[PDB]
Amino acid sequence: DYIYPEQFSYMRELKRTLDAKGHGVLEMPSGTGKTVSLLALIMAYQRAYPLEVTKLIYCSRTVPEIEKVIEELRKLLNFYEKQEGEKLPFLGLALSSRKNLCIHPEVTPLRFGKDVDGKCHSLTASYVRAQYQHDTSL
Amino acid sequence: EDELNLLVIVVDANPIWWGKQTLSKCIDAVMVLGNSHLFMNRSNKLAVIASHIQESRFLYPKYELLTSANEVIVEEIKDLMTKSDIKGQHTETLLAGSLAKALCYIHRMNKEVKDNQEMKSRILVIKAAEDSALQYMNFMNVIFAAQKQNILIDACVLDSDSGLLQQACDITGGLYLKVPQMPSLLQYLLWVF
Amino acid sequence: RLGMMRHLYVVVDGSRTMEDQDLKPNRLTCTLKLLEYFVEEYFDQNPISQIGIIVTKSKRAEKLTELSGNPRKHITSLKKAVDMTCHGEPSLYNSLSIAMQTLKHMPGHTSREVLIIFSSLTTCDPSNIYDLIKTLKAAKIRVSVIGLSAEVRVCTVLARETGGTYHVILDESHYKELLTHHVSPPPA
Amino acid sequence: TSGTLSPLDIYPKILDFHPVTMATFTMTLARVCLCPMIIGRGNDQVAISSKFETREDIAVIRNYGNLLLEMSAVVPDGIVAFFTSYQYMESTVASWYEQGILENIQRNKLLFIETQDGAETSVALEKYQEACENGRGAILLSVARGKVSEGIDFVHHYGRAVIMFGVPYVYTQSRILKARLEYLRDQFQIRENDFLTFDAMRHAAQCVGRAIRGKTDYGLMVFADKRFARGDKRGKLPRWIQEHLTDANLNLTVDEGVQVAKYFLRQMAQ
């Protein structure tokens, strides 16, 4: 049970930089250590207010960088609970477009006028109809 | 002179010296060498040990001490001359024992010196005798201890074949010389090492 | 020091890059000269041992000395090599296969060792080098690399996988320290 | 955040809001990094006017093609040459595949052109990490905007030097972009350096940042341009302040190629 000397030196100032409840800017290294040290610096506030507990979201340019965020954060948590975990009893998830995650829905309705939003609407409609009385055929 | 230096000289007593025909001369030469060594620096010290056939013995333990050293050596060797282990009655010598004694002394001197600064020491063997298989474990034990200690073991083989000593120098990073012309003993001691 | 017996195959880079003046007179001259100093110091520290000498030059491997226990052949071979110099590019796979062939023969309690002095960036050999590295580790042939100003990944993995000795040399003083490190025996 | 951002101003400029500021990591000495510039050495080295760098054949042939070949052949390490466009890249390296018979580099490098393929990209990075000068991130050409900017997350310090053959610069299309340039003239007046130059230099800094990765690694990064001093002001590149105690990140020298080889000996020694 510990965290870096760097995190200890710059925690109070970072909690203060966070207090303003709207915005802030942070200087960090060229990449190695930056994202993991953020997770270490948000460990200080993982339950700042018990009556509402705020959440973290991260924005990312491409899919291979997302696995770098997940693999580091998976090492830091080690598990969702004290049963195997020791910094954060957190739950974390990757996501990206329906256009990336799902190949078969792009393939089957092949038409020019077939927006990625529309395909979720179409799949939802087949599921409601199929569940009703079309499961055998739609 | 800043560094204290202890040079231990192990003299192989073996009756091989008979083949030499002289021990008295060898002592005289060794004495001259010691006096020079002590004279070179204040901080130089010397210890002399005899590796005899039966056992190893301490001949002596500073340059001011030299007069004392000379007497102690002459007397000690004469006692050694005894008939037992005569001629090649016993080909080998107890070098392992001598080296053990030398390392003990070096260690003790070092501890005292530890109170102060570092000490540098090296061991010189004047070897007349031959090595034997039985000797291998004991000798190597002492040799390896010296190497770890980083104490060089130099050897001057007047005669005979002590392979272990040759190995001891390579190992220890010391110097080994098989002397052609044993009467040149003084030159080798001064020059060789 | 006595306790066991060593077999070591000294491998030298005789590529065109070894001609360069960066390390005294030129790298070839400074490396062979210090390597002669190492042979006599290793054989003095290791009286019961063997060495064999190989070079890589002009996209091939050549045997400068056969595997033997007399130091004199190896210093005489390092003297004879300097005149014929270096040109072209390595052949490391063929040099590890001839070295393997000699080293595989050796008995149970003796070391298996390859020492490489490396001033290149790759090697000309077509054969799959990873199969040969796997085979070195099974055979217990340990390979060490002393590189000149160079960390190119296949060589570094090859020395780590075979036992853990990829070293960089930036001066004639540093190269004598590295060879003198290799003079040191293994545990028995 | 963006790794570096010490000159601070551009983000509050873009926001029209004033965030709380904070620097929240302990940095390492300047000496593990080296950030060169190249332009010529003697007074006869006049071919780099860059009044029309996209058309100046003599300038492409002279230190733009020739300095790259001198630096790459002398400094034999895995080095990626970043270019401002494909067309420059194609003209500078004759390669196996030449745009003309008249082009001025002859040396084994690898390409990174359009229709990059995710599987094909890896083949080139496998080659650069394994051995030899050439590969992706190795002695290879790529446009700085392109995919090579994602990099690879290898432990091995696969990269050594990057030589930006031209400073990464951008344009402003005579449509919505031109309308934006006018608006920011009206508001800032000092619009050109903020709207285009600084924004292109960060494009540079991402590629060099991806090469050197962070505090636990070492590297260098060179820029090839006539106008390069302008780039050095306002701390628009990584060279700028992080801790006063660091003893500066200076790059002036009478010879770049020698200074980087001396710097690599220094790094092997460390």
PDB file of C-alpha atoms in Angstrom, chain A residues 6 9-10 13-14 16-17 20 23-32 34 41 61-65 68, chain D residues 1 3-6 8 15 17 19-26 150 153 209-210 213-217 242:
ATOM      1  CA  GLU A   6       6.000  12.562  -7.141  1.00  0.00           C
ATOM      2  CA  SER A   9       4.749  16.125  -3.638  1.00  0.00           C
ATOM      3  CA  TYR A  10       2.067  17.362  -6.084  1.00  0.00           C
ATOM      4  CA  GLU A  13      -1.671  21.528  -5.273  1.00  0.00           C
ATOM      5  CA  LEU A  14      -3.483  19.209  -7.839  1.00  0.00           C
ATOM      6  CA  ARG A  16      -6.493  22.686  -5.276  1.00  0.00           C
ATOM      7  CA  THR A  17      -6.100  22.991  -9.131  1.00  0.00           C
ATOM      8  CA  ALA A  20     -12.293  25.600  -8.903  1.00  0.00           C
ATOM      9  CA  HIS A  23     -11.617  24.095 -15.501  1.00  0.00           C
ATOM     10  CA  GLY A  24      -7.839  23.570 -15.272  1.00  0.00           C
ATOM     11  CA  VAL A  25      -4.647  22.864 -17.266  1.00  0.00           C
ATOM     12  CA  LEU A  26      -1.945  20.386 -16.264  1.00  0.00           C
ATOM     13  CA  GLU A  27       1.807  20.017 -17.390  1.00  0.00           C
ATOM     14  CA  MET A  28       3.048  16.569 -17.634  1.00  0.00           C
ATOM     15  CA  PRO A  29       5.905  14.410 -19.420  1.00  0.00           C
ATOM     16  CA  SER A  30       6.056  13.722 -23.277  1.00  0.00           C
ATOM     17  CA  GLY A  31       4.095  10.662 -22.566  1.00  0.00           C
ATOM     18  CA  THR A  32       5.655   7.910 -20.453  1.00  0.00           C
ATOM     19  CA  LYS A  34       1.531  10.987 -17.795  1.00  0.00           C
ATOM     20  CA  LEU A  41      -3.522  11.854  -8.687  1.00  0.00           C
ATOM     21  CA  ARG A  61      -7.602   9.938 -30.678  1.00  0.00           C
ATOM     22  CA  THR A  62      -7.339   6.157 -31.779  1.00  0.00           C
ATOM     23  CA  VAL A  63      -8.011   2.546 -30.789  1.00  0.00           C
ATOM     24  CA  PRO A  64      -4.282   1.294 -30.097  1.00  0.00           C
ATOM     25  CA  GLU A  65      -3.823   4.282 -27.555  1.00  0.00           C
ATOM     26  CA  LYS A  68      -2.383   1.646 -23.491  1.00  0.00           C
TER      27      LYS A  68
ATOM     28  CA  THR D   1      -2.807  18.491 -21.089  1.00  0.00           C
ATOM     29  CA  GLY D   3       2.798  16.714 -22.231  1.00  0.00           C
ATOM     30  CA  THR D   4       4.709  19.913 -22.567  1.00  0.00           C
ATOM     31  CA  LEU D   5       2.706  23.219 -22.600  1.00  0.00           C
ATOM     32  CA  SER D   6       4.887  25.653 -20.481  1.00  0.00           C
ATOM     33  CA  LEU D   8       0.707  28.431 -21.449  1.00  0.00           C
ATOM     34  CA  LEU D  15     -10.599  28.691 -24.895  1.00  0.00           C
ATOM     35  CA  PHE D  17     -11.459  31.100 -20.704  1.00  0.00           C
ATOM     36  CA  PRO D  19      -8.158  27.754 -16.544  1.00  0.00           C
ATOM     37  CA  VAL D  20      -6.308  27.179 -13.219  1.00  0.00           C
ATOM     38  CA  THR D  21      -2.731  26.440 -14.249  1.00  0.00           C
ATOM     39  CA  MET D  22      -0.356  23.793 -12.745  1.00  0.00           C
ATOM     40  CA  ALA D  23       2.830  21.933 -13.660  1.00  0.00           C
ATOM     41  CA  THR D  24       2.402  18.390 -12.004  1.00  0.00           C
ATOM     42  CA  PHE D  25       5.411  16.274 -12.716  1.00  0.00           C
ATOM     43  CA  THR D  26       9.163  16.345 -11.657  1.00  0.00           C
ATOM     44  CA  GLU D 150       0.932   7.015 -33.487  1.00  0.00           C
ATOM     45  CA  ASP D 153       4.646   1.038 -27.613  1.00  0.00           C
ATOM     46  CA  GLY D 209       7.740  13.439 -28.541  1.00  0.00           C
ATOM     47  CA  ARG D 210       6.810   9.900 -29.792  1.00  0.00           C
ATOM     48  CA  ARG D 213       8.738   9.121 -25.183  1.00  0.00           C
ATOM     49  CA  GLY D 214       9.439  10.561 -21.661  1.00  0.00           C
ATOM     50  CA  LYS D 215      11.919  11.180 -18.656  1.00  0.00           C
ATOM     51  CA  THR D 216      13.061   7.428 -18.649  1.00  0.00           C
ATOM     52  CA  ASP D 217      14.597   7.594 -22.169  1.00  0.00           C
ATOM     53  CA  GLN D 242      10.310  23.086 -17.390  1.00  0.00           C
TER      54      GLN D 242
END
